[PDB]
Amino acid sequence: SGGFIRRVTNDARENEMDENLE
Amino acid sequence: NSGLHIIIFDEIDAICKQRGSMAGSTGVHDTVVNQLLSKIDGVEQLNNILVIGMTNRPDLIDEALLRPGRLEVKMEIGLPDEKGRLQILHIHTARMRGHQLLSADV
């Protein structure tokens, strides 16, 4: 729903985490 | 059909100066002027701004910033003559004269 984590530093690590949560 | 936007610069000779005259600032007083020039009149065109500048040393400002199309109307404000002084002295005493706080022999 648009995301699950704040993008404090963007980076690839922030994508998969979000994806996982989704 | 748009409104009018006004911008006022005060003591404009502090940031804008002849390009290359300064040396030792590390290059911060040489890109500000370029940005200002590129913004006032650039490839894109605005038609709803009005920029006013004030200064005490008109000889130090950049030459490329005074050509027609950027800062056209250059005015000089000088000391008044007798009529001007009378006008000022009447302007600055109207409040006292209205309330009868000013004597009759002045």
Partner: protein
């Protein structure tokens, strides 16, 4: 005379601020969620 100063201009901004940033507080909640679903699966 040989006496002149200098002024510096800083190119300083990098990996996000110290842990006053939200990284740690963000990390906090994930472990709680893990506990919850571990309970459910067991």
């Amino acid at each position: 005379n040989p006496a002149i100063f200098a002024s510096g201009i800083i190119m300083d901004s990098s990996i996000s601020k110290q842990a006053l940033s939200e990284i740690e507080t963000r990390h906090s909640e994930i472990i709680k969620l893990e506990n919850s679903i571990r309970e459910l699966h067991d």
